[PDB]
Chains A and B, each alone.
Chain A
Amino acid sequence: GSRRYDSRTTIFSPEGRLYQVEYALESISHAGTAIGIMASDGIVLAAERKVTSTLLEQDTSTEKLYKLNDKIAVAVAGLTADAEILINTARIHAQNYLKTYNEDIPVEILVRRLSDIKQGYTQHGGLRPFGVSFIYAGYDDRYGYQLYTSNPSGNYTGWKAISVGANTSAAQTLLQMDYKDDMKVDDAIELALKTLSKTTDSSALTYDRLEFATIRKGANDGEVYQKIFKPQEIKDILVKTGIT
């Protein structure tokens, strides 16, 4: 029968590892780097686009940074098509919670459910796992500002600062060096851009190869604003810190 052609995607190695999860992580390590940094008054999301062409439409483009609701966003590293499947599920899940309880969904609850979906693809169904790692950036009135990451295994953890995708080892060492707890958003913006600039596989970091976003309480009184940076705004913030 069809047994002959079954890869057996959800089995253990003799060492107790999940083949397909390990190989999906290997795939993700070639994707463009994405960084998240959490400050006391906000969160920064920064990501590097995968080797760009000059004829690519840069302004009407979205590859790395996606909005889940008004209080939560994600940075993506891996297969984009896989990520959009998961993003739409997450968007719906948020609305289900709001419809049920009349309150915006707490960040961890959304992260847990999305991570639980990933877990399922590694234990049953015989399908390949999602080749995606997320950085979650969001706010709620319980824990305030929060950063999380999830990967193909369905395991998630919380962070003060974290990177996914390519050159995470070098990126993490640099973040660990210059990060401190009393940091402000504008300092975190600078750290994020400085780290990408040193870890990039490109010749020089320019505005057209970046996506950027902040989540501040920098609206008017006790409320949170999501700012997905426009091309010209990235060009300006790159000059303001003296990278170009």
Chain B
Amino acid sequence: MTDRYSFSLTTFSPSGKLGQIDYALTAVKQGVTSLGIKATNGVVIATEKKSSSPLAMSETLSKVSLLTPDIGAVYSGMGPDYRVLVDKSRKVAHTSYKRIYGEYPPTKLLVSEVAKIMQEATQSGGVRPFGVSLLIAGHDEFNGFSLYQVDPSGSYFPWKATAIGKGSVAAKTFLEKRWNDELELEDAIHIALLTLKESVEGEFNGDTIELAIIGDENPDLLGYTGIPTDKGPRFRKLTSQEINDRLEAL
């Protein structure tokens, strides 16, 4: 018994390709479209909620996840792989940062830790790479707002705006025409909803769309008062009703 697979399952082919990483990116291509747009005073991340059955309650399945009070994540590819990555990402923000410095990590460094975890699945013994690409949006005092993409290889890139998954090629082109460096958060939400309608086929409402923002601090979502320096989470998930309000003036 015991894990006898102590050798790499991802290796270089004669042409120089890393097969399993390439094949993981192929799995991401098949995945449902998700996107992110960076505004001057915030960031928006969005995706379609592909329901597996109409008897399924799609509210119980969250594709957009809070990592820290100021950082959120969305994905394209394999859902189960994403779920465990969120668990690991939430924990590493504490163990390797909050428990040392008494504050949450800046976006770039949390992203860096998630990338490390995904790189190790590319080299360690007896494991396949993760079959997901992540989009991580967040804010921190000294860097402001930022948006990052993390690929199965472990590579990450900062973006003004981008899309991943099914119809990413068309969605990226749409975002290039609309993005400028003076966009206000509400303008970015509007463009996010427009871009997503192109890749969605069936119903397009607040129950089939999942959307969250990184914006102003929310004191009403803190849960307590009395400490002036603690002002609340910048991450907020838009409600089903809040989405439909914006779909009328579309």
Contact = CB atoms under 8 A, between A and B. Distances in A.
A and B, direct touch (CB closer than 8 Å): yes
Contacts of B158: 56-57, 60-61
B160 A24 contact: no
A55 B38 CA distance: 10
Contacts of B51: none
Interface in A64-86: 79-82, 84-85
Given A126-B6, A131-B12, A53 B172 contact: yes
B148 to A, nearest CB: 9
A209 interface: no
Q: Which interface residue of B112, B147, B158 has the most chain A CB atoms within 10 A?
A: B158
Nearest to B146: A60
Interface residues of A, number: 36
B15 interface: yes
A5 B5 contact: yes
B153 interface: yes
Interface string A101-135: 00000000000000000000000011111010000
Interface string B158-172: 111110000000001
A57 B18 CA distance: 27
Contact of A27 (B16, B116, B157): B16
Contact of B115 (A24, A57, A84): A84
Contact of B17 (A9, A27, A60): A27
Contacts of B76: none
Given A29-B16, A57-B160, A61-B158, A127 B122 contact: no
A20 B15 CA distance: 11
B34 to A, nearest CB: 15
A125 B172 CA distance: 42
Interface string A30-61: 10000000000000000000000111110011
Interface in B126-183: 126, 143, 146-147, 153-162, 172, 175-176, 179
B153 A81 contact: yes
B8 to A, nearest CB: 4
B131 to A, nearest CB: 16
A79 B155 contact: yes
B218 interface: no
A128 B160 contact: no
Contacts of B14: 23, 26
A126 B7 contact: yes
Interface string B6-33: 1111111111111000000000000000
A9 B16 contact: no
Nearest to A127: B8
A174 to B, nearest CB: 24
A57 B149 CA distance: 11
B50 to A, nearest CB: 25
B208 interface: no
A220 interface: no
A25 B12 CA distance: 10
Contact of B5 (A2, A27, A56): A2
B58 interface: no
Given A79-B155, A81-B155, A23 B16 contact: yes
A7 B115 CA distance: 25
B72 to A, nearest CB: 18
Contacts of B175: 55
Interface of A: 1-2, 5-9, 20, 23-30, 53-57, 60-61, 63, 79-82, 84-85, 125-129, 131
Interface of B: 4-18, 38, 108, 112, 115-116, 118-119, 122-126, 143, 146-147, 153-162, 172, 175-176, 179
Sorted nearest first, the 5 A-B pairs with minimum C-beta distance are A81-B154, A27-B16, A126-B7, A26-B16, A23-B12
Given A60-B143, A80-B154, 20 more contacts: A2-B4, A7-B8, A9-B8, A20-B11, A23-B14, A23-B15, A24-B12, A55-B175, A55-B176, A57-B158, A57-B159, A57-B160, A60-B158, A61-B157, A81-B119, A85-B116, A128-B12, A128-B123, A129-B12, A131-B18
21 contacts: A2-B126, A5-B9, A7-B7, A9-B7, A20-B12, A23-B12, A23-B14, A23-B15, A23-B16, A26-B14, A30-B16, A55-B160, A57-B160, A79-B18, A79-B154, A80-B156, A84-B116, A85-B119, A126-B8, A126-B125, A128-B12
